[PDB]
């Protein structure tokens, strides 16, 4: 016979790239947008803006 | 039916908590730094 050596995702190395969080109701609330912005830094230049 | 948005995820570590100075009167003596 032949076994099936299963693999776990978290135990891989790639897992460090993305963060995985279990959101259960996504399939329902995905009907619209979520639309969060992030940021941008800005240097304080001299002279009046 | 003219879909809309929803409240966005906010980071678990979001700790604005600056109204503690800005509620009514700010106590600068030690409340800062934590900010």
């Amino acid at each position: 016979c032949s076994t099936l050596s299963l693999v776990r995702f978290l135990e891989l190395g790639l897992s460090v790239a993305c963060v995985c969080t279990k959101f259960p109701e996504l399939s329902y609330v995905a009907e619209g947008t979520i639309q969060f912005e992030v940021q941008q830094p800005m240097i304080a230049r001299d002279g009046p803006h | 039916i003219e879909v809309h948005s929803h409240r966005a995820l906010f980071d678990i570590f979001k700790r604005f908590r600056s109204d503690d100075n800005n509620l009514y009167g700010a106590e600068f003596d030690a409340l800062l730094g934590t900010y």
């Binding site: 135990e11 190395g13 109701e25 | 678990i12 908590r17 109204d19 509620l23």
Partner: peptide, 17 residues
């Protein structure tokens, strides 16, 4: 976590590095 509008105001795996 899904909150309403209420407000306040390890293991040892094998890998190559």
């Amino acid at each position: 976590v899904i909150a309403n509008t209420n407000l306040v105001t390890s293991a040892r795996v094998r890998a190559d590095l």
